[PDB]
Design a protein around this ligand. Structure first.
Ligand SMILES: CC(=O)N[C@H]1[C@H]([C@H](O)[C@H](O)CO)OC(C(=O)O)=C[C@@H]1O
Length: 628
């Protein structure tokens, strides 16, 4: 949906210049105080109690102003709420502030880490030293009661404890200045560790991220050895299949995502899955924004949810908040959860008792409220998509493939299967069976499990960089396998394209691909190498084509055997390639008026290089995988 979906709705929960908080005076008296702006939302579930956490920016929405940490909590899924100030600021000056709450729930405890500042008027990364700052950890305890039918809850907040004595003065060379949590909901790892992703500023103002974790429920804390590149901030972390996945804010460039299998000791950029997929605006050169990144189980399948504005207006406007759902292979855009063209901002998502919610910013004139959203239409779509993913994976994995010399052979590969183009299509769209990235079609006619091309630019474009802002097939620049069943229907005049990966840039360079020629020979394309002919094919005969690329090496297989010239380097330099799209047939909107008379069916895309057993299995099961 292009806006909050039919069936969903929201309320303004923390209302700018309206909702009050129980401000505690120095003398201990409480006064209901109006709050200019509420920012930096997090919503979590603590033993059945929704707890919403926010910066209460009392006087202005500016970062360096008088701020305290507010909490609203509900025992009836948002029907009613109680309000508190969980963490007070130091009251040292007119701009004293506790801000940027990062939260972990473990049992009936909430662990909140905030940055506390006394008097600075400038931005944290630019301070002369860390003398105005303390990282404060606060523990809240949620207690539920039951009085003749009615359930109520209380939350007690402990005294803040400064973690400044535990912050090293240096990291491998780097002289430290300050750190804050990554903002939003953090995690308890499967081993019980409290895991905060942190953002650290060095003396010069460079920012980078790290994991800070505790093995003893916050009694002690350790900074793990790994770190992000410089320029990463506001990290969000979740645990996936035994690894921490750290998703970073990157002002002015695409978002970096890292994985660590050893509690943050070693970080590896997620080039094969999520790194550089998301970004800060269509042109990637704008201020970025915080994102929520949470693992949940929907319809029996573990998935990750990610929120971020499209920010088409740029700077801090942060219009058009979207929610994506991924299983680390496919990436589905659930849609826009903010309304129309409104400015949004920081966000949080919660899945609780089979209902989905969001708490996020709305901004008019830099006065901010937080809306509490019931994502009813969105959850319905998510469940449908997860059912599609499970049904197709289970179907493929259950195919009885032919036995090979060494009941059934090996399973049709489903691990890392990202996209599949098969029977469903129309005149302009070839549908991804996995519902994420369709291919665009021209001059085509439907055939079982695919399309027959006839006319100028007859073919399909499966966009890679051409997806635009959110690059869900960015993994292909690091590795991929592309598979298809093909027939050549008419001889070409000279050479004509069939299947491949095109590159952005001058001319019409290809990374890896296959063409065919008037002599009935194949013409594999291995990067920039002169594409000489090899082998032999016949008109009207079906052939299986597999292109593999990993470790900068490319191979082209026909009928399960590599063509001459395979197995060499196809990308030179150290710079990742920038694939524009996969082409199927001879699509084009300009240049030579290519017209490849071929029929292509069952196009499969994987985010890894399939092994020999897998390639053979696909070659032997071509008549078995189609959607019909
Ligand atoms: C401590 C602090 O300043 N946090 C602020 C953060 C920060 O200024 C930026 O990441 C540059 O370091 O920015 C934003 C923001 O809406 O973009 C809100 C945070 O409250």
């Amino acid at each position: 949906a292009a806006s909050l979906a039919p069936g969903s709705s929201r309320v303004e929960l923390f209302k700018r210049k309206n909702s009050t908080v129980p401000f505690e005076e120095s003398n201990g008296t409480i006064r209901e105080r109006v709050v200019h702006s509420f920012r930096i939302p997090t919503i979590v579930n603590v033993d059945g109690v929704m707890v919403a956490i926010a910066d209460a920016r009392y006087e202005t929405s500016f970062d360096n102003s008088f701020i305290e940490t507010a909490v609203k909590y509900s025992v009836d899924d948002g029907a009613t709420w109680n309000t508190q100030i969980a963490i007070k600021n130091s009251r040292a000056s007119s701009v004293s502030r506790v801000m940027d709450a990062t939260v972990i729930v473990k049992g009936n405890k909430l662990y909140i880490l905030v940055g506390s500042f006394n008097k600075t008027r400038n931005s944290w990364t630019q301070h002369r030293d860390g003398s105005d700052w303390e990282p404060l950890l606060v523990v809240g305890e949620v207690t539920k009661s039951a009085a003749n039918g009615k359930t109520t809850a209380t939350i007690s907040w402990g005294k803040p404890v400064s973690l400044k004595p535990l912050f090293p003065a240096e990291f491998d060379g780097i002289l430290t200045k300050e750190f804050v949590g990554g903002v939003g909901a953090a995690i308890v790892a499967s081993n019980g560790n409290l895991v905060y992703p942190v953002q650290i500023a060095d003396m010069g103002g460079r920012v980078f991220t790290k994991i800070m974790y505790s093995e003893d429920d916050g009694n002690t804390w350790k900074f793990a050895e790994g770190r992000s590149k410089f320029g990463c901030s506001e990290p969000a972390v979740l645990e996936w299949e035994g690894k921490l996945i750290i998703n970073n804010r990157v002002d002015g460039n695409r978002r970096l995502v890292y994985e660590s299998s050893d509690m943050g000791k070693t970080w590896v950029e997620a080039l094969g899955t999520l790194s550089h997929v998301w970004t800060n605006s269509p042109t990637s050169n704008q201020q970025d924004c915080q994102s929520s990144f949470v693992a949940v189980t929907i319809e029996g399948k573990r998935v990750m949810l990610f929120t971020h504005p499209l920010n088409l207006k740029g700077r801090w406007m942060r219009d058009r908040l979207h929610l994506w759902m991924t299983d680390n292979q496919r990436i589905f855009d659930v849609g826009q959860i903010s309304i129309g063209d409104e400015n949004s901002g920081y966000s949080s998502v919660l899945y609780k008792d089979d209902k989905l919610y969001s708490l996020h910013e709305i901004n008019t004139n830099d006065v901010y409220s937080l809306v509490f959203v019931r994502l009813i239409g969105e959850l319905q779509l998510m469940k449908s998509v997860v059912r599609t993913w499970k049904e197709e994976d289970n179907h493929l994995a259950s195919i009885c493939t032919p036995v090979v010399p060494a009941g059934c052979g090996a399973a049709v590969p489903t691990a890392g299967l990202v996209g599949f183009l098969s029977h469903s299509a129309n005149g302009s769209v070839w549908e991804d069976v996995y519902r994420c990235v369709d291919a665009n079609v021209a001059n085509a006619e439907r055939v079982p499990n695919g399309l027959k091309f006839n006319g100028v630019g007859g073919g399909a474009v499966w966009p890679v960089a051409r997806q635009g802002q959110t690059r869900r097939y960015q993994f292909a620049n690091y590795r991929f396998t592309l598979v298809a069943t093909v027939t050549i229907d008419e001889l070409p005049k000279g050479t004509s394209p069939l299947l491949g990966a095109g590159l952005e840039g001058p001319g019409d360079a290809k990374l890896l691909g296959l063409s065919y020629d008037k002599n009935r020979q194949w013409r594999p394309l291995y990067g920039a190498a002169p594409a000489s002919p090899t082998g032999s094919w016949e008109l009207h005969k079906k052939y299986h084509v597999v292109l593999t690329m990993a470790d900068r090496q490319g191979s082209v297989y026909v009928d399960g055997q590599p063509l001459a010239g395979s197995g060499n380097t196809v990308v030179r330099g150290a710079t990742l390639p920038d694939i524009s799209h996969f082409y199927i047939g001879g699509p084009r909107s300009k240049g030579a008026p290519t017209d490849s008379r071929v029929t292509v069916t069952n196009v499969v895309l994987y985010n890894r290089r399939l092994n020999s057993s897998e390639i053979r299995t696909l070659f032997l099961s071509q008549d078995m995988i189609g959607t019909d």
